[PDB]
Amino acid sequence: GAPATVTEQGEDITSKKDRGVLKIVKRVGNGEETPMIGDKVYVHYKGKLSNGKKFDSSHPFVFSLGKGQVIKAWDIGVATMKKGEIAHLLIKPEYAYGSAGSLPKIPSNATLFFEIELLDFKGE
Ligand SMILES: CCn1cc(COC(=O)[C@@H]2CCCCN2C(=O)[C@H](c2cc(OC)c(OC)c(OC)c2)C2CCCCC2)cn1
Secondary structure, three states: OOHHHHHHHEEEOHHHHOOOEEEEEEOOOOHHHHOOHHHHOEEEEEEEOOOOOEEEOOOOOEEEEEOOOOOHHHHHHOOOOOOEEEEEEEEEEHOOOOOOOEEOOOOOOOOOOEEEEEEEEOOO
């Protein structure tokens, strides 16, 4: 399924190249411009734990990019997305909630998967 496909075929978009955040584009965007740090960003997402034990969906989620308001993986991943793009991210715990987790919702050393649609981004 989608998590396995990303694991096998996804681009490694971490700077350190440690496979911590893997990406596949699913639906292409419009324009060349991807959002700068500081931009208010608007998205629809689906999300789940590898554990199979929790699912979550926006189904408009709003955050300021690259400000650590979201897990590092989103700050990295969404920064590479263009308006109208849909992407799959698979994320190792180092780029999400780490060894501590975020109990009870997120366990220790969790791997996360997300499907993200980037709707738009305005400058702050
Ligand atoms: C106010 C900005 N914000 C940050 C968060 C923390 O979560 C996140 O940064 C990432 C990325 C952005 C979407 C939400 N998200 C998550 O991990 C989900 C998430 C959604 C949450 O609420 C919608 C949430 O509660 C605040 C939470 O707590 C750690 C984590 C998680 C995905 C795996 C399946 C369980 C939920 C929630 N809101």
